[PDB]
Amino acid sequence: AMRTIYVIGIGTGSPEFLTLQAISGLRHAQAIVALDQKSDLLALRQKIVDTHAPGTPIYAVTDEEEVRRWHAERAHLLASTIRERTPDDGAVAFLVWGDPSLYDSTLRIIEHMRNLEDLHADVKVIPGITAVQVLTAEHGILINRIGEAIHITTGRNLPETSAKDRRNCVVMLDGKTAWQDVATEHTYMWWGAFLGTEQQVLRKGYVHEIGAQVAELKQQLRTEHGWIMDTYLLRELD
Template sequence: MAAELDEHQTGGFLVWGDPSLYDGTIRVIGTIITRGALTLDYDVIPGISSVQALAARHRITLNRVASPVHVTTGRRLAEGLPNNTDDIVVMLDADLACKNLRAENIEIYWGAYLGTDDEILVSGKLGDVIDHIEQTRRELRQRRGWIMDTYLLRRNPRHEAP
């Protein structure tokens, strides 16, 4: 930033996902300021998060009536499903931890590259679609060099009228 911008210019970072959830960009900027590497002022401008995009694109809500939603990482999901909720949003899951839950009564709403022309959506009973999701992720990562995906697990699905 110091090499590219003079003191009167403005720079920016476009952050994919949601800067309020599991994003290191704000922490990195804080560290730069704390260490005195640069003197700068910054704002965080909210947009549509990957979690909001996931729900909108699948045309669902993240939770059911009067029920909580739990947001976690793949690493935490690998430790087990939370006991206090049946609706779990999972971000940052490099290993697709939900594949170990295929025998459970769970639906998945999965999306990759949400909000882009390359967006891909898959939903269904976890045991029925997880192999397809895993293969799709592998192919996309190989082709593009990276993948950014998010998903909702819905334990004990009840098909409620809209």
């Protein structure tokens, strides 16, 4: 009939964040794919699979005109791999850090690939715990004040974000230190890096007070580990 493609959120930093639904999907997949270096992450991901889908290898796919050429080749690669490793009624799982819906290209890639390679499949998305949810849980805070909007955005977008939206915003994908550029005396920040993991680091306080310190810390950690992923929440406590 058709194959099932599970797109499975595997959470952030720890195997404890996996849902029952995710575990069922992993255990029923006849093949596992991940579109991707960060050795710590590869190791965490393998640990999740070793625990729940032991005996199933992870097929990890890694990267002008060249990008467009790579996408076509990647599409052919994915379709061929799926057809080889699963029967016509079988199931493949794609692993996605956090939740598949949030700042991730896997679903888009799958949809493009299916169209280009004429791959008949039922796509089923399985939610997972996002970095945002780990940040708020580890700090023991609410993501909003009563009735308040929540603006989730990127470091690149932050300087162009309205003051009104910056009253309660979550910032992802910040390669720099964008809190320094938008803070007032009332701006409070909850920050975290390597959330969920044994190398988790949390900081909080007024940007007035801690912003330069966290900027220094983020560089220290990046030099040490070779990379860093942080998420933070800014709130105007006026």
